[PDB]
Coordinates of C-alpha atoms in Angstrom, one line a residue:
Chain A
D4 CA -29.9 24.9 8.3
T5 CA -28.9 23.7 11.9
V6 CA -27.4 20.2 11.2
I7 CA -24.8 18.8 8.9
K8 CA -26.3 16.0 7.0
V9 CA -23.8 13.2 6.2
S10 CA -25.3 10.3 3.9
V11 CA -23.2 7.2 4.1
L12 CA -24.2 4.3 1.6
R13 CA -24.9 1.1 3.5
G14 CA -21.8 -1.0 3.9
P15 CA -18.5 -1.0 5.8
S16 CA -17.9 2.9 5.3
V17 CA -20.4 3.4 8.2
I18 CA -17.8 1.9 10.5
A19 CA -15.5 4.8 9.9
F20 CA -18.2 6.9 10.8
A21 CA -19.4 4.8 13.8
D22 CA -18.5 7.2 16.5
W23 CA -20.5 10.2 14.9
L24 CA -23.8 7.9 15.4
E25 CA -22.9 7.3 19.3
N26 CA -21.3 10.7 19.8
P27 CA -22.6 13.2 17.0
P28 CA -19.9 15.9 16.4
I29 CA -20.9 19.5 16.5
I30 CA -19.4 21.8 14.0
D31 CA -20.2 25.7 13.9
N32 CA -23.1 25.0 16.5
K33 CA -24.4 22.5 13.9
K34 CA -24.8 18.8 14.9
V35 CA -23.3 16.2 12.5
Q36 CA -26.2 13.9 11.5
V37 CA -25.2 10.5 9.9
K38 CA -28.0 8.6 8.1
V39 CA -27.5 5.3 6.3
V40 CA -29.0 5.1 2.7
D41 CA -29.6 2.0 1.0
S42 CA -28.5 2.7 -2.6
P43 CA -25.8 4.9 -4.8
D44 CA -28.7 5.8 -6.3
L45 CA -30.3 7.2 -3.5
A46 CA -27.2 9.0 -2.1
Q47 CA -26.8 10.5 -5.8
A48 CA -30.5 11.7 -5.5
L49 CA -30.1 13.1 -2.3
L50 CA -27.0 15.2 -3.6
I51 CA -28.8 16.1 -6.7
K52 CA -31.7 17.6 -4.5
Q53 CA -29.3 19.1 -1.9
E54 CA -31.0 17.1 0.7
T55 CA -27.6 15.9 1.9
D56 CA -24.5 18.0 2.7
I57 CA -21.6 15.2 2.9
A58 CA -22.3 11.5 1.1
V59 CA -20.1 8.7 1.2
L60 CA -20.3 6.5 -2.0
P61 CA -18.3 4.6 -4.4
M62 CA -15.5 6.7 -6.1
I63 CA -16.6 5.7 -9.5
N64 CA -20.1 7.3 -8.5
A65 CA -18.2 10.5 -7.2
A66 CA -16.2 10.7 -10.6
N67 CA -19.4 10.3 -12.8
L68 CA -21.5 13.1 -10.7
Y69 CA -18.5 15.4 -11.0
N70 CA -18.2 14.5 -14.9
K71 CA -21.6 15.2 -15.5
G72 CA -21.7 18.8 -13.7
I73 CA -23.2 18.3 -10.2
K74 CA -21.6 20.7 -7.9
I75 CA -19.5 18.1 -5.5
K76 CA -16.2 17.9 -4.6
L77 CA -14.0 14.9 -3.3
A78 CA -12.8 15.2 0.6
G79 CA -11.0 11.8 0.6
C80 CA -11.4 8.3 1.3
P81 CA -11.7 6.5 4.8
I82 CA -11.8 2.9 4.1
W83 CA -9.0 0.9 2.1
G84 CA -10.1 -3.0 2.5
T85 CA -13.1 -3.7 0.4
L86 CA -12.5 -6.7 -1.4
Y87 CA -11.3 -10.2 -0.6
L88 CA -11.4 -13.6 -2.4
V89 CA -12.7 -16.5 -0.5
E90 CA -12.5 -20.1 -1.5
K91 CA -13.9 -23.5 -0.2
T92 CA -11.8 -26.6 0.3
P93 CA -12.1 -28.8 -1.5
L94 CA -12.9 -26.7 -4.3
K95 CA -15.8 -28.4 -6.2
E96 CA -17.4 -26.4 -9.2
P97 CA -14.8 -23.6 -9.6
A98 CA -16.7 -20.6 -10.9
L99 CA -15.8 -17.4 -9.2
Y100 CA -18.9 -15.6 -8.2
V101 CA -18.9 -12.1 -8.4
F102 CA -21.6 -9.2 -7.2
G103 CA -22.0 -5.9 -8.8
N104 CA -21.6 -6.6 -12.3
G105 CA -19.9 -3.6 -14.2
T106 CA -19.2 -1.7 -11.1
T107 CA -16.1 -1.5 -8.9
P108 CA -15.7 -5.0 -7.3
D109 CA -16.3 -6.8 -10.7
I110 CA -13.7 -4.5 -12.3
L111 CA -10.9 -5.1 -9.7
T112 CA -11.7 -8.9 -9.7
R113 CA -10.9 -8.9 -13.3
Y114 CA -7.9 -6.9 -12.8
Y115 CA -6.8 -9.0 -10.0
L116 CA -7.2 -12.3 -12.2
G117 CA -5.3 -10.9 -15.0
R118 CA -2.7 -9.4 -12.9
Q119 CA -2.1 -12.9 -11.2
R120 CA -2.6 -14.8 -14.5
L121 CA -5.6 -16.8 -13.1
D122 CA -8.5 -17.2 -15.4
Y123 CA -11.5 -18.4 -13.2
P124 CA -14.8 -18.5 -15.0
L125 CA -16.7 -15.3 -13.6
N126 CA -20.5 -16.1 -12.6
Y127 CA -22.7 -12.9 -12.2
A128 CA -25.8 -14.9 -11.0
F129 CA -25.6 -13.1 -7.7
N130 CA -25.8 -9.2 -8.1
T131 CA -25.4 -8.5 -4.4
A132 CA -23.0 -9.7 -1.5
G133 CA -25.7 -10.9 0.6
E134 CA -26.9 -13.1 -2.5
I135 CA -23.2 -14.7 -3.0
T136 CA -23.2 -15.2 1.1
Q137 CA -26.2 -17.1 0.8
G138 CA -25.0 -19.0 -2.3
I139 CA -21.8 -20.0 -0.4
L140 CA -23.7 -21.2 2.7
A141 CA -26.3 -23.2 0.5
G142 CA -23.5 -25.0 -1.4
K143 CA -23.7 -23.1 -4.6
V144 CA -20.7 -21.2 -4.4
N145 CA -17.2 -22.2 -3.7
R146 CA -15.0 -19.4 -4.8
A147 CA -16.3 -15.8 -4.6
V148 CA -15.3 -12.0 -3.6
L149 CA -16.9 -10.5 -0.7
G150 CA -16.3 -7.2 1.5
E151 CA -17.7 -6.9 5.1
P152 CA -19.9 -7.9 7.0
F153 CA -21.0 -10.3 4.3
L154 CA -17.2 -11.7 4.3
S155 CA -17.2 -12.1 8.3
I156 CA -20.7 -13.9 7.9
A157 CA -19.6 -16.2 5.6
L158 CA -16.3 -17.0 7.0
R159 CA -18.3 -17.7 10.7
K160 CA -21.1 -19.8 9.0
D161 CA -18.8 -21.8 6.8
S162 CA -16.1 -23.0 8.7
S163 CA -14.4 -24.7 5.5
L164 CA -14.2 -21.1 4.1
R165 CA -11.0 -19.3 3.8
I166 CA -9.6 -15.8 2.3
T167 CA -7.2 -16.6 -0.3
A168 CA -6.2 -12.9 -1.6
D169 CA -6.8 -9.4 -0.7
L170 CA -7.9 -7.9 -3.8
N171 CA -7.5 -4.1 -2.8
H172 CA -3.9 -3.3 -4.3
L173 CA -2.5 -2.5 -7.1
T174 CA 0.8 -4.0 -6.8
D175 CA 2.5 -5.8 -4.2
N176 CA 4.6 -2.5 -3.1
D177 CA 1.2 -0.7 -2.7
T178 CA 0.4 -1.5 0.8
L179 CA -2.2 1.6 0.7
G180 CA -4.4 -0.1 -2.1
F181 CA -7.2 1.4 -4.0
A182 CA -9.1 4.6 -3.3
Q183 CA -12.5 3.1 -4.0
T184 CA -14.9 4.9 -1.5
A185 CA -15.4 8.6 -1.7
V186 CA -16.4 11.2 0.8
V187 CA -17.9 13.9 -1.2
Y188 CA -19.3 17.3 -0.3
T189 CA -21.2 20.2 -1.4
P190 CA -20.3 23.7 -1.9
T191 CA -21.7 25.0 1.4
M192 CA -19.5 22.5 3.2
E193 CA -16.1 23.8 2.0
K194 CA -15.8 26.1 5.2
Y195 CA -16.1 22.9 7.1
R196 CA -13.9 20.7 5.3
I197 CA -11.0 20.7 7.7
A198 CA -13.3 20.6 10.9
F199 CA -15.1 17.6 9.5
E200 CA -11.9 15.7 8.3
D201 CA -10.4 16.6 11.6
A202 CA -13.5 14.7 13.3
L203 CA -13.5 12.0 10.7
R204 CA -9.8 11.1 11.4
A205 CA -10.9 10.8 14.9
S206 CA -13.9 8.5 14.4
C207 CA -11.5 6.5 12.2
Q208 CA -8.9 6.2 14.7
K209 CA -11.6 5.1 17.6
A210 CA -12.7 2.0 15.2
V211 CA -9.2 1.1 14.7
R212 CA -8.1 1.4 18.5
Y213 CA -11.6 0.4 20.2
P214 CA -13.0 -2.1 17.5
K215 CA -15.4 -3.9 20.2
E216 CA -16.7 -0.7 21.4
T217 CA -17.1 0.4 17.9
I218 CA -18.9 -2.8 17.1
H219 CA -21.2 -2.5 20.2
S220 CA -22.1 0.7 19.3
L221 CA -23.0 -0.2 15.6
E222 CA -25.0 -3.0 17.1
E223 CA -27.0 -0.8 19.7
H224 CA -27.8 1.6 16.8
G225 CA -29.2 -1.2 14.7
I226 CA -26.6 -1.0 11.8
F227 CA -25.2 -4.4 11.8
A228 CA -26.7 -7.4 13.4
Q229 CA -25.3 -8.8 16.7
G230 CA -22.0 -10.6 16.1
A231 CA -22.0 -10.0 12.4
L232 CA -18.8 -7.9 13.0
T233 CA -15.5 -9.0 15.0
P234 CA -12.3 -6.9 15.6
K235 CA -10.9 -8.8 12.8
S236 CA -13.8 -7.6 10.4
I237 CA -12.4 -4.1 11.6
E238 CA -9.0 -4.9 10.5
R239 CA -9.7 -6.2 7.1
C240 CA -11.7 -2.9 6.5
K241 CA -8.3 -0.9 6.8
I242 CA -10.0 2.1 8.2
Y243 CA -8.1 5.4 7.9
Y244 CA -8.9 8.9 6.5
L245 CA -6.6 10.2 3.7
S246 CA -7.7 13.7 2.1
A247 CA -7.9 13.5 -1.8
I248 CA -4.8 15.8 -2.0
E249 CA -2.8 13.4 0.0
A250 CA -4.2 10.3 -1.7
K251 CA -4.5 11.9 -5.4
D252 CA -2.3 9.4 -6.8
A253 CA -4.5 6.5 -5.3
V254 CA -7.6 8.2 -6.6
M255 CA -6.7 8.8 -10.1
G256 CA -4.8 5.5 -10.5
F257 CA -7.7 3.6 -9.4
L258 CA -10.2 5.7 -11.8
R259 CA -7.6 5.2 -14.6
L260 CA -7.6 1.3 -14.0
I261 CA -11.9 1.6 -14.1
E262 CA -11.7 3.3 -17.2
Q263 CA -9.3 0.9 -18.8
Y264 CA -12.3 -1.5 -18.3
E265 CA -15.4 0.5 -18.2
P266 CA -14.9 4.2 -19.3
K267 CA -18.5 4.7 -19.0
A268 CA -18.4 3.8 -15.2
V269 CA -16.6 7.0 -14.4
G270 CA -18.6 9.0 -16.8
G271 CA -16.0 9.0 -20.0
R272 CA -12.9 10.5 -18.8
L273 CA -10.8 11.4 -15.7
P274 CA -12.2 14.1 -13.5
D275 CA -10.1 17.2 -14.1
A276 CA -8.4 19.2 -11.3
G277 CA -11.6 20.8 -9.9
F278 CA -12.3 17.4 -8.3
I279 CA -10.1 17.5 -5.5
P280 CA -9.9 21.0 -3.4
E281 CA -6.8 23.2 -3.9
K282 CA -4.2 22.9 -1.1
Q283 CA -4.5 26.8 -0.2
Chain B
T2 CA 12.2 23.3 -15.2
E3 CA 15.8 22.6 -14.9
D4 CA 16.0 26.1 -13.5
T5 CA 13.2 25.5 -11.2
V6 CA 13.3 22.2 -9.4
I7 CA 15.6 19.2 -8.8
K8 CA 13.4 16.0 -9.7
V9 CA 13.8 13.2 -7.4
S10 CA 12.3 9.9 -8.1
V11 CA 11.8 7.3 -5.4
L12 CA 10.5 3.7 -5.8
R13 CA 7.9 2.8 -3.3
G14 CA 9.3 0.7 -0.5
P15 CA 11.2 0.7 2.5
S16 CA 13.8 3.1 1.0
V17 CA 11.2 6.0 1.0
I18 CA 11.8 6.0 4.7
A19 CA 15.1 7.7 3.8
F20 CA 13.5 10.2 2.2
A21 CA 10.4 10.7 4.1
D22 CA 11.3 14.1 5.5
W23 CA 11.2 15.5 2.2
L24 CA 7.3 15.0 1.8
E25 CA 6.9 17.7 4.2
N26 CA 10.2 19.3 4.3
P27 CA 11.8 19.3 0.9
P28 CA 15.3 21.0 0.8
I29 CA 16.1 23.9 -1.4
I30 CA 19.4 23.5 -3.2
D31 CA 20.8 26.3 -5.2
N32 CA 17.6 28.3 -5.1
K33 CA 15.7 25.1 -6.7
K34 CA 13.1 23.3 -4.6
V35 CA 13.7 19.5 -4.5
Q36 CA 10.6 17.7 -5.6
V37 CA 10.2 13.9 -4.8
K38 CA 7.7 11.8 -6.6
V39 CA 7.3 8.3 -5.7
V40 CA 7.1 5.8 -8.3
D41 CA 5.4 2.0 -8.2
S42 CA 7.7 0.1 -9.9
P43 CA 11.6 0.1 -10.9
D44 CA 10.5 -0.5 -14.6
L45 CA 8.6 3.2 -14.2
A46 CA 11.9 4.2 -12.4
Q47 CA 14.1 3.1 -15.2
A48 CA 12.0 4.8 -17.7
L49 CA 12.2 8.1 -16.1
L50 CA 16.1 8.0 -16.4
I51 CA 15.9 6.6 -20.0
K52 CA 13.5 9.3 -21.3
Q53 CA 15.6 11.9 -19.1
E54 CA 12.6 12.9 -16.8
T55 CA 14.3 12.8 -13.7
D56 CA 17.3 14.2 -12.2
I57 CA 18.0 11.9 -9.1
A58 CA 16.4 8.4 -8.8
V59 CA 16.5 5.9 -6.0
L60 CA 16.1 2.3 -7.7
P61 CA 17.4 -1.2 -6.8
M62 CA 21.3 -1.4 -7.2
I63 CA 20.7 -4.0 -10.1
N64 CA 18.7 -1.7 -12.1
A65 CA 21.2 0.9 -11.8
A66 CA 24.0 -1.5 -12.8
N67 CA 22.0 -2.5 -15.8
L68 CA 21.3 1.2 -17.0
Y69 CA 24.8 2.2 -16.8
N70 CA 26.1 -1.0 -18.8
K71 CA 23.3 -0.3 -21.5
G72 CA 24.8 3.4 -21.6
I73 CA 22.5 5.6 -19.7
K74 CA 24.2 8.5 -18.1
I75 CA 24.0 8.0 -14.5
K76 CA 26.7 7.6 -11.7
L77 CA 25.9 6.1 -8.1
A78 CA 25.7 8.5 -5.4
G79 CA 25.4 5.8 -2.8
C80 CA 22.9 3.8 -0.9
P81 CA 20.5 4.8 2.0
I82 CA 19.4 1.4 3.3
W83 CA 21.1 -1.3 4.4
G84 CA 18.3 -4.1 5.8
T85 CA 17.9 -7.1 3.9
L86 CA 15.7 -10.1 4.2
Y87 CA 15.1 -11.6 7.5
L88 CA 14.2 -15.3 8.3
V89 CA 10.9 -15.7 10.3
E90 CA 9.4 -19.0 12.0
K91 CA 6.5 -20.1 14.0
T92 CA 6.7 -22.1 17.2
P93 CA 5.8 -25.0 17.2
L94 CA 7.8 -25.6 13.4
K95 CA 5.2 -28.1 12.1
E96 CA 6.6 -28.1 8.6
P97 CA 10.8 -27.4 8.0
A98 CA 10.2 -26.1 4.5
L99 CA 11.4 -22.4 4.1
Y100 CA 8.9 -20.3 1.6
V101 CA 10.6 -18.0 -0.5
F102 CA 9.6 -15.4 -2.9
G103 CA 11.0 -14.2 -6.1
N104 CA 12.4 -17.3 -7.5
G105 CA 15.7 -16.8 -9.6
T106 CA 16.1 -13.1 -8.1
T107 CA 17.4 -11.4 -5.4
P108 CA 15.2 -12.4 -2.6
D109 CA 15.9 -16.1 -3.6
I110 CA 19.7 -15.6 -4.2
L111 CA 20.5 -13.9 -1.0
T112 CA 18.4 -16.4 0.8
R113 CA 20.5 -19.6 -1.0
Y114 CA 23.7 -17.4 -0.2
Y115 CA 22.7 -17.2 3.1
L116 CA 21.6 -20.8 3.8
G117 CA 24.8 -22.0 2.1
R118 CA 27.1 -19.8 4.3
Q119 CA 25.2 -21.3 7.3
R120 CA 25.2 -24.8 6.0
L121 CA 21.4 -25.2 6.5
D122 CA 19.6 -27.8 4.4
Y123 CA 16.2 -26.4 4.5
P124 CA 13.6 -27.5 1.4
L125 CA 12.7 -24.5 -0.4
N126 CA 8.8 -23.7 -1.2
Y127 CA 7.9 -21.0 -4.2
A128 CA 4.2 -21.7 -4.0
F129 CA 4.0 -18.0 -3.1
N130 CA 6.3 -16.2 -5.3
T131 CA 5.6 -12.6 -4.1
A132 CA 5.9 -11.5 -0.3
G133 CA 2.3 -10.4 -0.1
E134 CA 1.5 -14.1 -0.8
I135 CA 3.7 -15.2 1.8
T136 CA 2.6 -13.0 4.8
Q137 CA -0.9 -14.1 3.5
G138 CA 0.0 -17.8 3.5
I139 CA 1.6 -17.1 7.0
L140 CA -1.8 -15.8 8.2
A141 CA -3.5 -18.8 6.5
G142 CA -1.3 -21.1 8.6
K143 CA 0.1 -22.8 5.6
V144 CA 3.8 -21.2 6.2
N145 CA 6.1 -22.1 9.1
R146 CA 9.3 -20.7 7.9
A147 CA 9.8 -17.8 5.4
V148 CA 12.1 -15.1 4.4
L149 CA 10.4 -11.6 4.3
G150 CA 11.5 -7.8 3.9
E151 CA 9.7 -4.9 5.1
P152 CA 7.1 -3.8 5.3
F153 CA 5.6 -7.2 4.7
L154 CA 7.8 -8.9 7.6
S155 CA 6.1 -5.9 10.1
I156 CA 2.7 -6.6 8.7
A157 CA 3.2 -10.4 9.1
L158 CA 5.0 -10.2 12.3
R159 CA 2.0 -8.1 13.9
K160 CA -0.9 -10.4 12.5
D161 CA 0.9 -13.4 14.4
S162 CA 2.4 -13.5 18.0
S163 CA 3.9 -17.1 17.3
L164 CA 6.0 -15.5 14.5
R165 CA 9.3 -14.7 15.3
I166 CA 12.7 -13.5 13.5
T167 CA 15.3 -16.2 13.7
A168 CA 17.7 -14.5 11.5
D169 CA 18.9 -11.1 9.5
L170 CA 20.5 -12.7 6.4
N171 CA 23.1 -10.1 7.0
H172 CA 24.3 -12.0 10.2
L173 CA 27.0 -14.5 9.2
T174 CA 30.1 -13.7 11.4
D175 CA 30.6 -11.8 14.9
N176 CA 31.9 -8.6 13.2
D177 CA 29.3 -8.2 10.0
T178 CA 29.6 -5.6 7.7
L179 CA 26.6 -3.1 7.3
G180 CA 25.8 -5.7 4.6
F181 CA 25.2 -5.7 0.7
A182 CA 24.1 -2.2 -1.1
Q183 CA 21.0 -3.2 -2.6
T184 CA 19.7 0.2 -3.3
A185 CA 21.0 2.8 -5.4
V186 CA 20.7 6.6 -5.4
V187 CA 21.9 7.5 -8.9
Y188 CA 22.2 10.9 -10.5
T189 CA 22.8 12.6 -13.9
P190 CA 25.5 15.0 -15.3
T191 CA 23.8 18.3 -14.5
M192 CA 23.7 17.1 -10.6
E193 CA 27.2 16.7 -10.2
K194 CA 27.6 20.4 -9.1
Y195 CA 24.9 19.2 -6.3
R196 CA 26.2 16.1 -5.4
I197 CA 27.5 17.2 -2.0
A198 CA 24.8 19.3 -1.1
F199 CA 22.2 16.6 -2.0
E200 CA 24.2 14.0 0.1
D201 CA 24.2 16.2 2.9
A202 CA 20.6 16.7 2.7
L203 CA 19.8 13.0 2.3
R204 CA 22.3 12.2 5.5
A205 CA 20.0 14.7 7.2
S206 CA 16.6 13.0 5.9
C207 CA 18.2 9.6 7.0
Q208 CA 19.2 10.9 10.6
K209 CA 15.7 12.1 11.0
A210 CA 13.9 8.9 10.4
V211 CA 16.3 7.3 12.8
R212 CA 16.0 9.9 15.6
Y213 CA 12.2 10.7 15.0
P214 CA 10.7 7.1 13.8
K215 CA 6.8 7.9 15.2
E216 CA 7.0 11.2 13.4
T217 CA 8.6 9.6 10.2
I218 CA 5.9 6.7 10.2
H219 CA 2.9 9.2 10.8
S220 CA 4.2 11.4 7.8
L221 CA 4.4 8.4 5.8
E222 CA 0.7 7.3 6.7
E223 CA -0.5 10.7 6.3
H224 CA 1.0 11.1 2.7
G225 CA -0.6 7.4 1.8
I226 CA 3.1 5.9 1.1
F227 CA 2.6 3.2 3.7
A228 CA -0.9 1.7 5.2
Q229 CA -1.6 2.8 8.4
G230 CA 0.0 0.5 11.1
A231 CA 2.1 -1.2 8.4
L232 CA 5.5 0.3 10.0
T233 CA 6.3 0.7 13.5
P234 CA 9.6 1.9 15.0
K235 CA 11.0 -1.3 14.8
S236 CA 10.6 -1.5 11.1
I237 CA 12.7 1.5 10.8
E238 CA 15.5 -0.2 12.9
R239 CA 15.3 -3.2 10.7
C240 CA 15.6 -1.1 7.6
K241 CA 19.1 0.3 8.8
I242 CA 18.5 3.9 7.5
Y243 CA 22.0 5.0 6.6
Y244 CA 23.3 7.1 3.8
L245 CA 26.9 5.9 2.6
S246 CA 28.6 7.4 -0.3
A247 CA 29.5 5.0 -3.0
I248 CA 33.1 5.0 -2.8
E249 CA 32.9 4.3 1.0
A250 CA 30.3 1.5 0.0
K251 CA 32.3 0.3 -2.8
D252 CA 32.8 -3.3 -1.6
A253 CA 29.2 -3.6 -0.4
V254 CA 28.1 -2.7 -4.0
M255 CA 30.9 -4.8 -6.1
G256 CA 30.3 -7.9 -3.6
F257 CA 26.4 -7.5 -4.2
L258 CA 26.7 -7.3 -8.0
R259 CA 29.0 -10.1 -8.1
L260 CA 26.5 -12.5 -6.1
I261 CA 23.5 -11.5 -8.3
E262 CA 25.5 -11.6 -11.7
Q263 CA 26.8 -15.1 -11.0
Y264 CA 23.2 -16.4 -10.6
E265 CA 21.2 -13.8 -12.7
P266 CA 23.4 -12.0 -15.4
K267 CA 20.5 -10.6 -17.5
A268 CA 19.4 -8.5 -14.4
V269 CA 22.7 -6.5 -14.1
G270 CA 23.4 -6.2 -18.0
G271 CA 25.3 -9.4 -18.3
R272 CA 28.4 -8.3 -16.7
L273 CA 29.7 -6.1 -13.6
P274 CA 29.7 -2.4 -14.3
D275 CA 33.0 -0.7 -15.1
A276 CA 34.8 1.6 -12.8
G277 CA 33.2 4.7 -13.8
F278 CA 29.9 3.7 -12.1
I279 CA 31.4 4.6 -8.8
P280 CA 33.1 7.7 -8.9
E281 CA 35.9 8.7 -6.0

């Protein structure tokens, strides 16, 4: 092999990796090659087939694959801002529309509503964020949960719409929030783990420090439509890389929460200690 | 485990700043490593003491008083943090209402005490009953005046350049004491022989925060204690990180517990703690 293949599930995690599209890092005389994939399913298939080396996909999938015996480990999490509640004023029909029934966004919305003692009726009519966005714009949806870029698009195209809550935290003292997104790697990547984490830290820093340039590059590479993201969109994504060792409590706490609602979503148990590399 | 480590629990919040250096550089006392574990809530901190699963704990002074009164075998070592609420406002000041969180509890009580001492007649609004809701509400542009503590004060002030600090709730006179002692470091009976060693180590850790704020913040971020960018060196200054032994802080302790106990007797155990709370 002469390249390091990185598969990023389509979504806001590509923002953390943007500078690797712009300026692919070279590790051990291998170019790091980022490809956006359109579903967790497709991302999982690539990992199982050993057609990708590193993949970025939901933490619940990472846990499930690990529990099922797939040879991956968790490197860490690069993005911390994935779910926000939006509401229109005035609030006509009050159903809260939620995409991804049975998966992270749904479970976290249910958690938030319970914690805050709100009991809005959940509507699962739209399974995707894009569909929810369109429902807002067409007048069907007055309250919803969204992440970027759909959040930004909805806010732009309906200037009545407002963010009313941040759904990314276990508690108020939890400024870090949930480790909902996993960077996972295969065994031949162990020797490159620290090198790739170092480069990912740089890419994450660049997104945060140079958002306009980051957006510009993503647009040139066709990842997002022109004007879909703004620097505020990047701010809401809360881009920062933490190693799984450093974030072990945010990882296992998140997985435990999911398991309380839907144990099958993580494969029936919390991953054992081999999920995270040793400190060595 | 007694022969091996000294277990220190710290409640996640601004007082972890005092202990930040022990994340990378935990001290060794009597050939035992100090092991810091950050806990998410006061209830979790209390449970560790009730169940005798931690050696030293750092939790709100009100909880420490409550446990002492209920016969839990702890003593107060001292207080490592002196920052209180701050009052913030936007100009223009479109609405005079002062938004407060924690109705009937410490932040509300300190706010009412301050406004009373200063003879200020602001109407009080509790629609955002946590500080996360207020910062959000300030972000939304519904809040022109509020009380906030760290880190939410830094998070709020950052997002909004119109937002400014107008008061340190501690500032009533021309010669202010360091202020109320709101955070307890408490210890169990087998820790007596270690009291001076631990206090000296905690003084060193506190001074490190003050002297090396950037490095301190970076360590806190890299260990996932605070979200990246939450804290700035000014945040550290506003926290007033400084360890003072309980006997030296006696008036600051008892003065504070007298305020809380007049308005919220349940929180302190229904009486002020007797003398054995604060050893000489």
